[PDB]
Amino acid sequence: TGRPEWIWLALGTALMGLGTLYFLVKGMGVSDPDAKKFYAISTLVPAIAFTMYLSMLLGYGLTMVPFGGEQNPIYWARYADWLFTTPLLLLDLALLVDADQGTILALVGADGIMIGTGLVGALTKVYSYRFVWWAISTAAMLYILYVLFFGFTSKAESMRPEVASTFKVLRNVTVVLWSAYPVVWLIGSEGAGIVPLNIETLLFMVLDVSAKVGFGLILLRSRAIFG
C-alpha cells in the first residue's frame, strides 16, 4: 500500500518499542514494591502503543468512513490504544498523590467516556453529528483535566516536595499534551479534513510518544516513585 503516513507509523513503533524495553529493563532491576508498581504501569503504556502502531503500520486499525461526500480514512486502532493507555497514565498520577479510590474510579470512568464518544464520533456518518460526539468527548477530557489541576495538585501538597514537584511536571506535560488531541482531531481527518493524514499522523506520534515515553522517563527517573 505504501500510504504517505507510514513513515510516522514506523517512527512511532520504533520509539514506543525502545521506550518499552528500557523501562522494562530498568523496572525488573528495582526491588522497591512501590517503584515496581509505577514501573509496571509505565512500561505497559508504551507497550500497548507499540503494538497498535505496529498493527497500523502493517495495515490494520484503518477503516473508510463515509461523510462530507468522501470515503474518509479513519485509524480506529488509536482508540484501542488510548482506551487502555490513557487511564493507565491517569493511574500513575493518582498513585503519586495518593488519590482516593472514588477519584480514580471517576477519572477512569470519565476517560472511558472520552475515548468511547471519541471513537463513535470518528465513525459517525452524518458530518455534523461527528462534532456532537467530539464535543462530548472533549467535555469529558476537560473534566479529567479540571480534576488533575484542581484536585490532585491539592492532595500532592500532603506529599513531600520531591513528590509534589514531580507531579507538577507530569501534570503540566499531561495538560499541555492532552489539550492538543481534540484540536488535531477537529482540523484533521476525523473532522474538518484541513490537515492531511500524513501530517496528522506526525502530530499524533509526537503527542503519543511525548505523553508516554516522555512522561515515563520523567516519572521513572524520579525518587518520588519509592515507597
Residues from 72 through 91 that contact ligand RET (CB under 6 A): 82, 85-86, 89
Q: Is 47 in the site for ligand RET (CB under 6 A)?
A: no
CA dihedral 113, 109, 201, 193 (to 10 degrees): 20
Region label for 69, one of left (φ > 0), alpha (ψ between -120 and 50) or beta (otherwise): left
Least Cβ distance, residue 138 to ligand RET (angstroms): 4
Angle (nearest 5°) at CA 6 between 203 and 74:
65
Among 31-39, 123-131, 157-165, 177-185, the segment contacting ligand RET (CB under 6 A): 177-185
State which residue has the least CB distance to ligand RET. Answer: 118
Q: Is 43 in the site for ligand RET (CB under 6 A)?
A: no
Please state, in angstroms and rounded to a whole number, the distance separating the CA atoms of residues 127 and 81.
24
Q: Is 61 in the site for ligand RET (CB under 6 A)?
A: no
Least Cβ distance, residue 32 to ligand RET (angstroms): 25
Q: What residues contact residue 52 under an 8 Å CB cut-off, 6+ apart?
A: 61, 77, 78, 80, 81
Q: Is 166 in the site for ligand RET (CB under 6 A)?
A: no
Inter-residue contact 62 to 178 (CB < 8 Å)? no
Residues of this chain that bind ligand RET (CB under 6 A): 82, 85-86, 89, 114-115, 118, 134, 137-138, 141, 178, 181-182, 185, 208, 211-212
